[PDB]
């Protein structure tokens, strides 16, 4: 066979990265009776941070709730940071 030949090249090289800025999000407000308990939405927190919020973790929480499940501990979880962040005014009234 003819086969090939030659080959060589360098450059560039290794490149820097960019860091992105930060904003507000802190916040920890909310508590109203009504279904789901803020222990409830609590510990969820707590678990999904000290043992984090993983798939098979909400099957730990689910079970520490009462007779909770897996995919509504995600689904409040997950729901969590959405309300979180969109707030609409947190705090209309106590009375």
């Known amino acids: ?10 450059l560039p090289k290794a490149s820097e990265a960019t860091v992105c800025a930060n904003n507000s999000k802190v916040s920890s407000t909310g508590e109203k ?6 222990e ?3 510990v969820i927190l707590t678990m999904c941070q000290e043992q984090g919020a ?7 929480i ?3 709730l009462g007779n909770k499940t897996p995919v ?3 689904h409040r979880f ?5 309300l979180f962040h969109t707030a609409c005014e ?3 009234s106590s009375g």
Do not use: C, I, N
């Open 62 to 64: 689910s079970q520490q």
């Open 40 to 42: 409830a939405d609590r």
């Open 54 to 60: 993983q798939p098979h973790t909400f099957s730990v």
């Open 1 to 10: 066979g003819p086969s090939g030949s030659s080959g060589a090249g360098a």
């Open 72 to 74: 509504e501990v995600s």
């Open 90 to 92: 947190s705090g209309p």
């Open 78 to 82: 997950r729901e969590l940071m959405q």
């Open 33 to 38: 009776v009504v279904l789901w308990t803020r």
